[PDB]
Design a protein around this ligand. Structure first.
Ligand SMILES: [Mg+2]
Lengths: 492, 55, 82, 51, 446, 95, 252
DNA sequence: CCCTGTCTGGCGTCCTCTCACCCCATG
DNA sequence: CATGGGTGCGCCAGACAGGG
């Protein structure tokens, strides 16, 4: 009876490595809840278990509050202090109440609350101790297969889930099968599956390589990037600081044994291992393997790279359904345009001709001088307007007066182009002039400007009949806007 | 809900016996017209014109 | 459904009707096969006799389809192995 | 107390031509007969026409 | 569990593995608890409600015997007042003194003082008798009762159901015209007549020429005659008519016949009994018809002529649905019909899966025991007579006897797979054990 | 239906009146009602102006009677410490 | 608890699931027949009247047992062997066992009969539809002899129904009952007075010619029109209906 | 042994619904 | 306490005597 409480507390404390205090607090809450259910009225109840005897006293708790909303469970601070002057806001006032007999009903409630406390203590500490597993490749047994997810048993009442998107496209699991996967997220669904496991994401590939390649687990080789088409093909980029170690050779292993072990675990996924380079162009050449790259052109402003290949290698460089270029682009972070050497030259000739036409049209220069600007690397009016004067003065035949005139023309061309578009639609010119009339939204200003009504004066000159076809403009609203425009233009 | 209430059955019905007797009409010079004479039998809780109006 | 007269007109024994319709309803209920006639949320028994009345099911066609869809499963297994 | 089950013609299964079958639900535990009898007696004679 | 054995910690007793469970009762009947009896074998502690019933019955018997003494003492004092009307009467002096001394007043040795002495003997007998009988009645209430071997207390509770009527009860007249009441129509659908009143019950005419009980039609016509006289009394009384016209009509309705036995006259009822006799006749006039010396046809006709009913007994009746007349006028009247206690919510029963018998694993029999209907031998013959073979196999292996077969069946039904795993009847194994328990060696070959 | 329907167209600021009630109408325990009467609290409008801290100073008013008063006031949508401007109305000042 | 959602569940499982009704003294095989349930507010099994002549079941306090075919082969045996539409001939002979018993033959015998004068004596009618229209409106009587024009379908070819239309000197009730007869039977099956032997051989000739399904639907239409016109008949029994012979006392 | 009288056995409708009561006796 | 100590049914039918 008495000594049995101590023996139970000691057995549970030792078996679940849990603080005795946390078990008692929970038993007190369990007994309070079991007591509340025996009364027809909603009462507040505190239970206190004596830590030496295992005896327990049950109260009618009265949550000491400032304002009473529930007179059956709450008492004012003034009324609580009339019974005991030591009470504060948030304390409990008690009332001698018959403790519930410990029948198999309370026993079952106590068992359930202990089990729940162990899930939030023993199992929580087990998950904390398995900080590596929360991130590394956990191993589970398939408990249940549904259409949209697989429930894994990890042991110790821990359940994990693999979602349909987190599976490989050709995997078929049965109840009782062993499955490995990366624990990529821990949420708070204690009841059910709080653990989310992936086999499809790139982290599964990284951690399989960490286990299979000791040199990655020892931090001698680093995986810098991983790009993956799950169950089909992946690319990994590897670097080492030790010049004595070939990082690609280490990840492949003797006759490919290491990469084949990882591929086999991923259902026969093809894995390319590439050397990481700190030069983006050299890294993209490596990422494009097994296709040979002839030339690369880098557009830093668009964050894009044009990759020229021999006409025989084009199909290999793109890969089946663009898989090779897509995985290389995801691995590099660059947008990759794969074309032939002939197509790249034709593209550059078309861009050079478009730049020459743009410069000839807007800068009032001859085609010979526009060609020199494009040969010196200028492709946009913005570059010519904003580039440091020193770079323009390095061009053979440019003097300081001609560079100043060229920049002034480039700035004037940009201003004209911007103003034209803003007046054609409702970007700035019609979004201020035509939109001056109170009531003009940006959409209506662009609809007006599409009819050639670009200014508040143009609107003041219109009739209601001239605007009647504008979708969303009633004759009354047209008349109000024309009158508002006339009041500002003619009577302001 | 308490033990002291007593529930009787509820016959919410004011009328007892409704008998119509159709008969020939002569007030109007036009013949082949009919008169509908309805003798109801109320228990006093319903006015007869109110009964025929609700019906 | 009221009478089963034409389901005996097409299977003359009136006892083989029960075997063929039971085999058909066991294929439709637990095995998860689609009915060959569009239903009206009838139970699987009436859908079985309704397929019998169309003529598209009797014991000959059921043996033909079980042999072909057993040979298909073993052919899929053999082409998966070799 | 004056709130009854207001009915409606859920379907008009007009069988073939010059023939319909109009079903009306739901009525009270006794109003099917009074509407059937009223419509039956009126259609029979009251309804006018030429012949 | 540790928490189940921790009953001793917070409380005591022992362990909680023991199945805690309160004897709760089954369904099928409503009611209102009208009377509770509690009997206690002597020695057992009476609880608070048994002491409440003991105080209640002590109080009832105390009040009842005290009212016996008070009522018989009131009759005795009324006798004393009736005796002292003459012979030394005191008109004012009688109620000045308390009432228990009505004997020592001025009166000589006569029959009256002798009678007051005899009433004093009776009164003192009632006093000492009331003392000893109240002591004996407290003994009868307070004592225990001899009961069954090993029972503490018996609680008896009286539910009082009120069963109305429904489609399925059995009603019948007094001539053999039985019948299950089949539809409880609304008021409007009933065939009414050209006065307005709906008929209550519509029987079937075709039961008369085959089942030759022609007496029910004469009973119907004479009942309509009786109610015609009752309606004429109700009409002559609802109009607040003086007693002369009521006397006239009641006398004409009581003469009305051949040489008969009754021969009453209302000239010796004195104008107040005739109103109360008409208060009792207004719901109909009762008519005696002795067994083999009864009312002939012409007397029924002459009594139907006294009321203004049609002579042939048949009123033309309209319809409730169509509102148009039934051709060939029909017979209405009053028949005296009885409800029989073969009700329908005492016969109706249904069983999915209940308890099973012990010696042969088949369901129990009856309704109080929640049982299943006997699929008897002739029904087995009637299913052999069709070609139904699987229906009979599950009708005597799966649904009835084989225990593993029926648990497989219950799992298969709640999972949607209609399929039976047959097995063997367990009662056939009982047949093997009973034949094998003789010197006979029955087996199962192969 | 048109014929049959045409053949039938000739037939077819001190709260409110609750503040003016006496405290006895609140169904309070005989203890709570007698404690309020001892402090000259006669109307519900007088009770609603008093704070919980003021009611606890009243002789013989316990924490239990204060909870009863709150639960009863809450059942009527009233709370302790509401300020009524112009209470008591001149209609009550003459009793 | 019997919540509000289990009654829709119940109307889902009852549908297309036959039950075996069984009278307690089952003597022959027609005393176990399989029906489809229709749910009843009540506590009494409602049993179709024609089927009663098979069970020897009156309604004077009788009781019946219901049994549920659990498995799937048993549902199919209840529908395909033991269904009540399948038992329309007694196995002891060739006589139909779904013969109309007592109210319905009175309704027919009052309907198809004649009297020498009624409303609409000897008027001429363009079809059975206006025969029923003249009976309902109140212009003729149910038994009033009349020339109608009926179109009887005689199937004299090899499975082809040939229409022959003619004027039969008949009554109003015989035309109204001709609206219910299926196509292949001749008009002379209703031209007589239709007692009980005549309606039994009517259903028997319908079963021998047109097969099972018109005979089931025609047995139901017989029962419905017999009950309806027996209700319209008002065929009571009185004390005056038993006519004493005037010659009885002189014979005695 | 061939017929005659006797002596014992085997059997007689199906479903249901209540009720009442189940071994003394005693050294 | 624990054990142990009526006399109103009627037919069929075959086996067992019983004459014959
Ligand atoms: Mg019977």
């Amino acid at each position: 009876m008495n000594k049995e409480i101590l023996a139970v507390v000691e057995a549970v404390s030792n078996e679940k490595a849990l603080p005795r205090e946390k078990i008692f607090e929970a038993l007190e809450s369990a007994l309070a809840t079991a007591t509340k259910k025996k009364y027809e009225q909603e009462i507040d109840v505190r239970v206190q278990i004596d830590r030496k005897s295992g005896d327990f006293d049950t109260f009618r708790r009265w949550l000491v509050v400032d304002e009473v909303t529930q007179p059956t469970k709450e008492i004012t601070l003034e009324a609580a202090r009339y019974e005991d002057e030591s009470l504060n806001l948030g304390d409990y006032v008690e009332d001698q109440i018959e403790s519930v007999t410990f029948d198999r009903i309370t026993t079952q409630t106590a068992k359930q609350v202990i089990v729940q406390k162990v899930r939030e203590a023993e199992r929580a500490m087990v998950v904390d101790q398995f900080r590596e597993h929360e991130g590394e490749i956990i191993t589970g047994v398939v408990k249940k297969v549904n259409r949209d997810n697989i429930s894994l048993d990890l042991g110790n009442n821990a359940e994990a889930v693999i979602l349909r998107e987190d599976m490989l496209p050709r995997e078929n699991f049965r109840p009782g099968d062993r499955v490995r996967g990366v624990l990529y997220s821990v949420r708070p669904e204690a009841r059910g599956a709080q653990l989310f496991v992936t086999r499809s994401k790139p982290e599964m590939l990284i951690e399989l390589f960490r286990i299979e390649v000791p040199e990655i687990g020892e931090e001698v080789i680093e995986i810098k990037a991983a790009a993956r088409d799950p169950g089909s093909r992946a690319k990994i980029a590897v670097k080492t600081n030790d010049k004595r170690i070939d990082p690609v050779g280490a990840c492949v292993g003797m006759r490919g044994a290491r990469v084949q072990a990882v591929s086999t675990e991923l259902g026969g996924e093809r894995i390319d291992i590439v050397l990481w380079d700190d030069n983006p162009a050299q890294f993209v050449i490596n990422a494009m393997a097994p296709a040979d790259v002839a030339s690369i052109v880098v557009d830093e402003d668009k964050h894009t790279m044009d990759i020229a290949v021999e006409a025989g290698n084009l199909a290999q460089a793109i890969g089946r359904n663009g898989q090779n270029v897509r995985l290389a682009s995801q691995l590099s972070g660059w947008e990759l345009n794969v074309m032939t050497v002939d197509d790249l030259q034709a593209k550059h000739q078309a861009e050079a001709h478009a730049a020459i036409d743009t410069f000839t049209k807007y800068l009032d220069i001859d085609e010979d001088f526009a060609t020199v600007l494009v040969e010196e690397g200028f492709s946009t009016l913005e570059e010519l307007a904003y580039v440091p004067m020193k770079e323009l003065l390095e061009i053979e035949g440019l003097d300081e007066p001609t560079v100043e005139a060229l920049r002034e023309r480039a700035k004037n061309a940009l201003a004209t182009i911007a103003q034209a578009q803003e007046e054609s639609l409702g970007d700035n010119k019609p979004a201020d002039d035509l939109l001056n009339l109170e009531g003009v939204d940006r959409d209506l200003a662009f609809k007006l400007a599409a009819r050639g009504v670009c200014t508040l004066e143009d609107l003041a000159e219109q009739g209601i009949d001239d605007l009647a076809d504008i979708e969303g403009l009633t004759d009354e609203k047209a008349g109000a806007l024309i009158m508002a425009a006339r009041n500002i233009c003619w009577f302001g | 809900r308490p033990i002291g209430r007593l529930l009787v059955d509820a016959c919410y019905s004011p009328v007892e016996r409704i008998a119509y007797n159709v008969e020939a009409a002569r007030v109007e010079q036009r013949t082949d017209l009919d008169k509908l004479v309805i003798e109801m039998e109320t228990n006093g809780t319903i006015d007869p014109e109110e009964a025929i109006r609700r019906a | 459904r009221v009478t089963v007269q034409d389901a005996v007109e097409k299977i003359g024994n009136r006892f083989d009707l029960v075997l063929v319709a039971a085999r058909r309803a066991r294929q439709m209920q637990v095995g998860g096969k689609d009915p060959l006639v569009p239903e009206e949320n009838d139970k699987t028994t009436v859908i079985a006799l309704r397929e019998i009345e169309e003529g598209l099911i009797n014991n000959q066609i059921l043996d033909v389809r079980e042999r072909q869809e057993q040979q298909e499963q073993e052919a899929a297994e053999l082409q998966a192995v070799t | 107390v004056t709130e009854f089950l207001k009915p409606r013609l859920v379907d008009i299964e007009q069988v073939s031509s010059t023939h319909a079958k109009v079903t009306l639900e739901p009525l009270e535990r006794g109003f099917g007969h009074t509407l059937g009898n009223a419509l039956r007696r009126i259609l029979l004679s009251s309804m006018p026409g030429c012949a | 569990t540790p928490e189940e054995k921790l009953l001793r910690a917070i409380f005591g007793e022992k362990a909680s593995d023991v199945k805690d469970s309160s004897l709760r009762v089954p369904n099928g009947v409503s009611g209102t608890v009208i009377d509770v009896q509690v009997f206690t074998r002597d020695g057992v502690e009476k609880d608070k409600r048994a002491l409440e019933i003991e105080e209640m019955q002590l109080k009832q018997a105390k009040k009842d015997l005290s009212e016996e003494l008070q009522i018989l003492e009131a009759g005795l004092f009324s006798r004393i007042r009736a005796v002292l009307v003459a012979g030394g009467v005191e008109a004012e002096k009688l109620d000045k003194l308390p009432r228990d001394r009505w004997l020592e007043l001025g009166l000589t040795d006569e029959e009256k003082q002798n009678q007051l002495e005899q009433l004093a003997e009776q009164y003192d007998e009632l006093k000492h008798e009331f003392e000893k009988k109240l002591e004996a009645k407290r003994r009868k209430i307070t004592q225990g009762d001899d009961l069954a071997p090993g029972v503490l207390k018996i609680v008896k509770v009286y539910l009082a159901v009120k069963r109305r009527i429904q489609p399925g009860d059995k009603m019948a007249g007094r001539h053999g015209n039985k019948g299950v009441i089949s539809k409880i129509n609304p008021i409007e659908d009933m065939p009414y007549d050209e006065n307005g009143t709906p008929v209550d019950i519509v029987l079937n005419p075709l039961g008369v020429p085959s089942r030759m009980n022609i007496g029910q039609i004469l009973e119907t016509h004479l009942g309509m005659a009786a109610k015609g006289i009752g309606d004429k009394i109700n009409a002559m009384l609802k109009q607040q008519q003086e007693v002369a016209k009521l006397r006239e009509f009641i006398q004409r309705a009581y003469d009305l016949g051949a040489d008969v036995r009754q021969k009453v006259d209302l000239s010796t009822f004195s104008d107040e009994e005739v109103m109360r006799l008409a208060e009792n006749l207004r719901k109909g006039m009762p008519i005696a018809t002795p067994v083999f010396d009864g009312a002939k046809e012409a007397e029924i006709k002459e009594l139907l002529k006294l009321g203004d009913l049609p002579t042939s007994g048949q009123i033309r009746l309209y319809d409730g649905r169509t509102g148009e007349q039934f051709e060939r006028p029909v017979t209405v009247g009053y028949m005296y019909m009885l409800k029989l206690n073969h009700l329908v919510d005492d016969k109706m029963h249904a069983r999915s899966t209940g308890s099973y018998s012990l010696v042969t694993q088949q369901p129990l029999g009856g309704k109080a025991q929640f049982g299943g209907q006997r699929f008897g031998e002739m029904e087995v013959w009637a299913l052999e007579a069709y070609g139904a073979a699987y229906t009979l196999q599950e009708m005597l292996t799966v649904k009835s006897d084989d225990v593993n077969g029926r648990t497989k069946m219950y799992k298969n039904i709640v999972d949607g797979n209609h399929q039976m795993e047959p097995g063997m009847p367990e009662s056939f194994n009982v047949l093997l054990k009973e034949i094998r328990s003789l010197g006979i060696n029955i087996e199962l070959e192969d | 239906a048109t014929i049959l329907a045409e053949q039938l167209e000739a037939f077819v600021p001190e709260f409110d009146p609750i503040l003016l009630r006496p405290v006895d109408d609140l169904e309070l325990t005989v203890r709570s009602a007698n404690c309020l009467k001892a402090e000259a609290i006669h109307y519900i409008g007088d009770l609603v102006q008093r704070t919980e801290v003021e009611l606890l100073k009243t002789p013989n008013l316990g924490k239990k009677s204060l909870t009863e008063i709150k639960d009863v006031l809450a059942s009527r949508g009233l709370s302790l410490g509401m300020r009524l401007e112009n209470w008591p109305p001149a209609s009550i000042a003459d009793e | 608890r019997e919540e509000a959602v289990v009654w829709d569940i119940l109307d889902e499982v009852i549908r297309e699931h036959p039950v075996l009704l069984n009278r307690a003294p089952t003597l022959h095989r027609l005393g176990i027949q399989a029906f489809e349930p229709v749910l009843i507010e009540g506590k009494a099994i409602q049993l179709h009247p024609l089927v009663c002549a098979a069970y020897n079941a009156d309604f004077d306090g009788d009781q019946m047992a219901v049994h549920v075919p659990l498995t799937l082969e048993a549902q199919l045996e209840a529908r395909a062997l033991m269904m009540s539409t399948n038992n329309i001939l007694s196995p002891a002979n060739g006589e139909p066992i779904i013969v109309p018993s007592q109210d319905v033959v009175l309704g027919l015998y009052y309907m198809t009969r004649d009297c020498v004068n009624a409303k609409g004596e000897g008027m001429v009618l363009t079809g059975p539809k206006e025969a029923e229209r003249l009976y309902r409106s109140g212009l003729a009587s149910l038994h009033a002899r009349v020339k109608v024009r009926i179109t009887e379908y005689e199937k004299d070819a090899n499975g082809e129904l040939v229409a022959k239309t003619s004027l039969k000197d008949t009554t109003v009730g015989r035309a109204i009952l001709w609206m219910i007869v299926p196509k292949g039977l001749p008009y002379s099956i209703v031209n007589q007075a239709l007692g009980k032997k005549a309606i039994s051989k009517m259903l028997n000739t319908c079963y021998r010619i047109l097969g099972l399904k018109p005979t089931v639907i025609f047995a139901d239409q017989i029962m419905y029109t017999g009950f309806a016109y027996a209700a319209r008949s008002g065929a009571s029994v009185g004390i005056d209906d038993m006519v004493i012979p005037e010659k009885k006392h002189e014979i005695i």
